């Protein structure tokens with residue numbers, strides 16, 4: 153049921169930017185999203201500092217809204233792109249900034265300060281990673297009720313960083329409109345026609361999130377990272393035509409769930425947790441299945457939970473002529489190897505692989521929240 | 537302005553599939569669009585008819601809505617993709633079938649029935665056309681309140697035609713959210729921050745549309761074309777970053793209109809018609825400006841009429857590193873030569889070319905309407 157969904161009709165609804173934590177992690181999913189990675193063009197630590205301050209300014213403004221910055225002298229470029237009209241509605245916009253492995257190289261001398269488990273994403277067996285769609289110094293996750301707002305945000309940012317950022321890759325996604333407008337009641341349905349994110353940790357549970365998502369002082373981590381979160385992002389293609397030609401029974405054996413209800417097979421309700429003990433040969437829920445491999449339920453690596461916050465995407469055609477569509481997968485963890493790396497390892501060889509093809513994304517660390525208007529992104533990181 | 541807009545929240549809204557004309561032409565603009573071109577895999581006229589009859593039935597079902605076709609034998613593929621859940625809501629869906637020049641080749645014996653002005657699109661001076669994004673035997677223009685309904689319909693059509701259609705190219709589009717909710721009280725804003733649609737002819741105006749948009753009996757066309765319409769589709773990239781860093785005065789000089797109000801420069805209202813004769817030097821509205829070149833409004837310029845129904849698009853990043861965003865331009869006209877072909881010939885060398893780049897699209901003839909449940913696409917074209 154977590155993190156929930158937020159209604160696309162709330163043009164004046166605001167999400168808090170300032171906080172202990174960044175919005176857009178625990179925040180219920182907005183209808184539209186953009187994942188955009190950048191290469192940082194900062195000369196030195198001081199320039200990186202200038203960028204993060206500037207990002208703070210822009211994010212505070214856009215996420216809360218206000219009248220479009222007008223342009224008193226027409227010899228100058230417009231201060232706003234104008235694609236939203238004369239007023240910049242906040243439209244439930246959240247902007248979540250996160251940093252890549254590559255940012256702690258020799259450029260800004262932040263190597264000693266790198267998060268412990270942060271690393272460059274390397275391939276898993278079913279992957280066909282496209283280098284054009286991988287990594288980046290920073291990633292921005294931009295969510296709002298509407299695609300218009302999201303894009304307006306991207307362009308405000310670009311207009312403000314021409315010598316600080318260069319767009320690396322970018323993908324836009326959505327969640328199924330029904331589940332978006334039902335407001336947390338209903339799970340988003342993916343483009344394979346199955347419900348996505350049923351088994352998520354209660355995101356309203358501020359105490360479980362401290363265990364699952366947030367970095368806490370107890371972990372073998374650099375002090376600045378506290379209140380942040382390891383972010384794993386995977387760009388996943390679906391073989392859609394082929395899928396729709398595949399028996400429903402087979403579709404259900406692959407996921408291990410009923411397609412209409414989202415309940416594990418042989419159980420009644422969507423959120424029913426199975427006992428795999430009773431099904432040693434996986435006659436009901438295959439040992440193959442997506443749900444089953446995703447957790448042996450051994451208790452010791454139930455400690456391996458993660459919050460998932462994915463989005464459908466639909467683009468054009470693939471290089472081979474098939475429909476280019478699937479999943480923008482995003483999950484947040486207190487620990488990257490304990491989270492995503494453990495689970496995907498666990499999932500290698502799953503029957504779903506015949507139908508999905510990971511092609512991009514990477515690992516990033518989502519910074520601590522900006523506490524208020526005198527704080528900024530990486531204020532903790534750049535000090536120390 | 538015309539043709540108006542429809543709000544994206546209305547899942548139980550219906551557009552009439554059947555009638556004298558196809559919907560998705562005069563219909564006010566829904567918030568989401570897909571243009572998808574197919575190659576035809578039918579080998580003879582018999583199979584073409586089989587396809588045309590089959591698209592009639594699929595389109596009638598999708599556009600009116602209904603419970604998803606249940607799959608009683610799950611050893612078969614699901615009869616529905618399930619990405620909409622149990623109910624296929626109408627969601628203002630319209631699906632408009634058009635046929636390309638190539639359909640009228642030696643395959644189907646249709647060469648003598650070809651629309652007088654139908655031709656393969658060939659480049660204009662500023663084009664950078666991509667083979668992969670051009671032409672097609674048939675084009676579908678699939679519009680609805682939501683992206684979900686549009687994709688669902690595509691996948692339904694694909695599932696049912698594996699021996700008859702192969703996807704050629706596909707782009708998804710959208711119109712600006714604020715204007716989505718105004719229901720026509722606002723013209724859509726394009727991704728350059730300017731209003732797109734202002735001077736469109738009155739789409740509710742019955743008699744005007746008979747002159748401007750529909751093929752009628754007085755024009756020298758094959759009978760089967762009556763009530764159909766010529767359709768030009770241009771896939772157009774915007775150089776968005778360069779634009780956003782261009783002076784407002786020059787942005788406004790290039791269009792010939794005030795960005796904030798949309799009014800022709802030197803006038804106060806959006807729909808004001810400028811009289812160019814009072815400004816022969818073009819000191820108020822530039823001579824190479826989009827409004828002036830397109831629309832001199834002279835003697836021979838009352839026949840160049842077309843109806844524009846364009847959508848914004850945003851994908852990822854071009855090979856060269858720029859945001860891939862632009863316009864899915866579609867227009868309708870009673871005669872392609874007198875409409876689009878004349879108008880673009882006038883636009884050649886306009887100042888806006890620096891900022892836009894046609895890369896795909898095509899010319900197609902949108903069929904006459906399916907009269908009722910006993911009629912089918914192409915009945916009159918396939919008859920004698």
Ligand SMILES: C=CC1=C(C)c2cc3[nH]c(cc4nc(cc5[nH]c(cc1n2)c(C)c5C=C)C(C)=C4CCC(=O)O)c(CCC(=O)O)c3C
Nearest residue numbers: 346347348349350351386388443446447481492495496508
């Ligand atoms: C390959 C394409 C993928 C699809 C179509 C997908 C979607 C799903 N993921 C699900 C559950 C899940 N998938 C999971 C691991 C992952 N799955 C991933 C990739 C995909 N994830 C990635 C990447 C994962 C992380 C490593 C986990 C951990 C669950 C939670 C279910 C459980 O048993 O706790 C479910 C079923 C509903 C639910 O939440 O139980 C769907 C439909």
Ligand SMILES: C=CC1=C(C)c2cc3[nH]c(cc4nc(cc5[nH]c(cc1n2)c(C)c5C=C)C(C)=C4CCC(=O)O)c(CCC(=O)O)c3C
Nearest residue numbers: 730731732733734735770772827830831865879880883892
């Ligand atoms: C090149 C990229 C294009 C952009 C940025 C564009 C956008 C616009 N097109 C406009 C009008 C128009 N554009 C028009 C022909 C075309 N326009 C085309 C492509 C574009 N059209 C193509 C291709 C055309 C076919 C020849 C016409 C005919 C009008 C209506 C004349 C007018 O008053 O602007 C207007 C002015 C307000 C309005 O909607 O009347 C904008 C902002």
